[PDB]
Amino acid sequence: GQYKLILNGKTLKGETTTEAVDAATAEKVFKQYMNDNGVDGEWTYDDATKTFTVTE
């Protein structure tokens, strides 16, 4: 499925997608990207829309 990340960071912001077999995998892919950019924050995932929203 196509999963989405809405990233509301202090120095990095945007909206991106990835294909992933499941939500657990999408979470890991997005966390890898966030970690590489030094971004972490509060977050929510809505399974109905396959969307993670992160707010630093």
Instruction: Go through the domains of the chain in sequence order and give each one's CATH number.
Output: 1-56 (3.10.20.10)
Q: What percent helix, strand, coil does the chain show, rounded to 5? A: 25, 45, 30
Measured between alpha carbons, how far is 31 from 56 in angstroms, rounded to an integer?
A: 13
Strand order in the sheet with 13-19: 13-19, 2-8, 51-55, 42-46
Measured between alpha carbons, how far is 5 from 20 in angstroms, rounded to an integer?
A: 12
* Resolution limit, Å: 1.1
Contact 6, 56 (CB under 8 A): no
Contact 41, 56 (CB under 8 A): yes
| Terminal-residue alpha carbon distance, the chain | 26
Residue 46 β-bridge partners: 51
User: Which residues are within 8 A (CB) of 16 and not within 5 positions of it... i.e. 6 or more apart?
Assistant: 4, 5, 7, 33
